[PDB]
Amino acid sequence: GARLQEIYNRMDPRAQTPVPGKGPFGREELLRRKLIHDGCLLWKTATGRFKDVLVLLMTDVLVFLQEKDQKYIFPTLDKPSVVSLQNLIVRDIANQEKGMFLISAAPPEMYEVHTASRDDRSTWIRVIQQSVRTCPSREDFPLI
Template sequence: MSSSIVRRLSIPECILLVTQRITKYPVLIQRILQHTKDSDSDHGCVCDALRCVKQLITAVDSKVNEQEKKQRLKEVYSRTDSKSIMRMKSGQMFAKEDLIRGRKLLHDGALQLKNSAGRLKDVQAMLLSDVLVFLQEKDQKYVFASLDQRSTVISLQNLIVREVANEERGLFLITAGTEKPEMVEVLASSKEERNTWRAIIQDAINGRADSENKSSVAGFTCL
């Protein structure tokens, strides 16, 4: 071939080159669509191709993101001290093994916890399927963060998320539905990061509630 782009490439290599550029497919098909008249017989096929390739890219991105989160959770798990343990508000003990026991990582990042004296502590926040976990580094390992007498493994059940009135980076995490509601204040690095955390945590809470409602309906039998 005379083209410098494909010169010295065999057919399999050319195919591989194309598949590596999957994100360019919508642009290519969109250009084709712009030069395809509505009256053309293949206009509908081009539209379908554009829709399908966008769905494919979304699916690929979703799977890649899922695998990256699995790998990230494994990394954190491997660095967590096996002796570290935390008592949850419910009284249940949460250990290292519970990080990966039937749970998925939804989001993680650096946050700060504020204690009762107003001091800030740097922590690594891990939002899992049903709990929000705060870890701190100690001797190059992760341990469950200490915060006065409050738990740093927070169930998403009955969790309320509120913005801090006079702190644009802050969030209140309020555990409701108990005899003694508990509140934890966290700070993000920016207002935008705070908003991201709030939205993702709220989505996780809503998703958990929807799953519980569906389970209740599925288990109901008419007499």
């Protein structure tokens, strides 16, 4: 809502992150979308380390942000920081009640994220599956 506007204003106008096969994704691309859910999560890097990230669940995408020096930035991992919601599925992590695998189809990729509680995880999973089955077509809503 106004939360999205806050986030937008807390971001450097030159901030940009690639979306493979689609194009660049900058601060303006945020305002093209509805902010459906947002929250801090833990991203498991390849390093096996956990990176604190602000996660935005939007109309058609998931956005990962980092709280670097009082502004927001797109982080730079070996996975895209913006992910298409289309045909995305959620898997549970065996024995880790607070973790979940997010597997995307555009293109195939896997993200591993952990919440703070079984409850938090339930909320995220619910709200993600919902946003995924109502994701707009790329014909009507290009990711660009």
